[PDB]
Amino acid sequence: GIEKIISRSMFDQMLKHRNNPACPAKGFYTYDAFIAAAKSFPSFGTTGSTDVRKREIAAFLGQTSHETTGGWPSAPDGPYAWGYCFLKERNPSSNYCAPSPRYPCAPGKSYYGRGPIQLSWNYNYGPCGEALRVNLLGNPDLVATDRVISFKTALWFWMTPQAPKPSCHDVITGRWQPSAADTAAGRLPGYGVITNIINGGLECGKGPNPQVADRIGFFRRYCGILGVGTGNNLDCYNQRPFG
Numbered sequence: 001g002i003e004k005i006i007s008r009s010m011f012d013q014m015l016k017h018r019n020n021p022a023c024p025a026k027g028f029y030t031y032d033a034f035i036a037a038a039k040s041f042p043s044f045g046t047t048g049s050t051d052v053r054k055r056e057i058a059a060f061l062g063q064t065s066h067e068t069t070g071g072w073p074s075a076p077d078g079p080y081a082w083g084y085c086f087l088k089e090r091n092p093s094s095n096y097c098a099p100s101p102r103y104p105c106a107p108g109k110s111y112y113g114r115g116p117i118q119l120s121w122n123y124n125y126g127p128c129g130e131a132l133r134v135n136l137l138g139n140p141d142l143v144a145t146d147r148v149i150s151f152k153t154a155l156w157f158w159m160t161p162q163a164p165k166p167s168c169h170d171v172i173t174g175r176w177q178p179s180a181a182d183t184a185a186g187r188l189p190g191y192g193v194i195t196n197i198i199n200g201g202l203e204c205g206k207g208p209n210p211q212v213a214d215r216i217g218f219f220r221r222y223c224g225i226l227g228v229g230t231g232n233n234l235d236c237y238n239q240r241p242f243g
């Protein structure tokens, strides 16, 4: 599997501070859990040329690193060495509950960000739990409790199209071709579109944004380590958010 492209030592170099005693998630995010989880999504990091596979791994780790970052500008090893520091969304402003016939909010539960992709909203927890055969809609805390399930939610999100959004996977592997609406809106293949899929409503199409820049910094660092180009279209500053 992906262990051939990303070794334990490389993962540890990338996520240099995940086991820092200063990080709330210390000990939770393990290479073994990452590899185990990836087995359930066998085309992740095994699609296309070696160059593409490395870029996919860098893109996934880059985005998830931003979602979980403990970085600050003057941090040791730079802000892009502080991925995977957090497990739960810091200071959430709501329970992330939206109307959903299929995946209604479970009374008393909250769908704030958890795990590497900071999975949010009942309408993500619902179908993710269905795919993973666990009750994430009724027990969203599971994403912050079992390390393999945690990684699986992130990979699920990455691998799953949700129209009109393609999967992050299909974008980074070059399988996704933009529609006429996409090319008009400047949603072109690259890391920027991936940011848009993940959190574009809040981060994209509004000009320069430090969260978008942070996502790019991790991706650049990881592509450097893996020895691949990042490609272009890295930001979504001028991209209309997806529908």
Ligand SMILES: CC(=O)N[C@@H]1[C@@H](O)[C@H](O)[C@@H](CO)O[C@@H]1O
Pocket: 066, 067, 068, 069, 086, 087, 088, 089, 090, 091, 113, 118, 199, 211
């Ligand atoms: C641990 C934490 O609070 N992570 C959040 C994440 O939930 C949010 O989606 C992201 C947006 O850019 O930035 C934050 O760092």
Ligand SMILES: CC(=O)N[C@@H]1[C@@H](O)[C@H](O)[C@@H](CO)O[C@@H]1O
Pocket: 080, 217, 218, 220, 221, 222, 223, 224, 225
């Ligand atoms: C954000 C980040 O770490 N960028 C680095 C850059 O500093 C370095 O010169 C290059 C080659 O090693 O790799 C990455 O682009």
Ligand SMILES: CC(=O)N[C@@H]1[C@@H](O)[C@H](O)[C@@H](CO)O[C@H]1O
Pocket: 117, 118, 119, 120, 121, 124, 157, 197, 198, 199, 200, 201, 202
């Ligand atoms: C990783 C994740 O859950 N991302 C969601 C995204 O699916 C949703 O479209 C958006 C709405 O603003 O909220 C983000 O938190």
